[PDB]
C-alpha cells in the first residue's frame, strides 16, 4: 500500500497512514503534528518547497527515517482548495519509498 | 521573472527588484519605504501579514496586488532565503 498523508499548507503533517512505521520508521503518531521539513535534509527541504512554487512528475525527495538513514520517496500531490472567508489549501499525498534493487 | 523583495519585520519594503515596474506598475522607488499592505487587495491583508510572520512554510502565498493603474494582479510569493528581514520571491500568476 502507498503511504497516504495530508499536509496543511504550511507543511504540518495533519495525517499520515500507519504504514509510516514500516517504511519510514515512525509511528503515525510520531509524525502527525510535526512538519514534513523536520524529516528532510536542507537539499530536500528546498526541493520540496520548490515543487509547490510551480507539474509533470510527482515530488521525489530523500526522507530521513527514524534510524537516521535516508530513503527515496515519490509523492503524488493533490491540492484541495476551499474558499470560505479566507482561501485555504490542503495537500493530499500518496507516497511510496523507492526501494533499492 | 521572479520579483525579489525584502521586507522588514513590520512589512516595510526594504528592497524590491527593478521588475516591479514591469509586473506591478510601480518603479522600485515608488514601493521601497512603503508598507507592502499598501499595495495589497484590502481583503488579502490578514492572509499575507500572517503568512510572512510565520516560520514554517511549504506552499506559496497567493494574493492580489493592486497595480498602479488600480487593477488587480494575482501573485504567489515564497520566502526565498531564511528583527529579521524577510527575503521573498514572487511572480505574477
Ligand atoms: Cl520558510
UniProtKB/Swiss-Prot annotation, chain A:
<protein>
    <recommendedName>
        <fullName>Sporulation kinase A</fullName>
    </recommendedName>
</protein>
<comment type="function">
    <text>Phosphorylates the sporulation-regulatory proteins spo0A and spo0F. It also autophosphorylates in the presence of ATP.</text>
</comment>
<feature type="domain" description="PAC 1">
    <location>
        <begin position="61"/>
        <end position="100"/>
    </location>
</feature>
<feature type="domain" description="PAS 1">
    <location>
        <begin position="1"/>
        <end position="57"/>
    </location>
</feature>
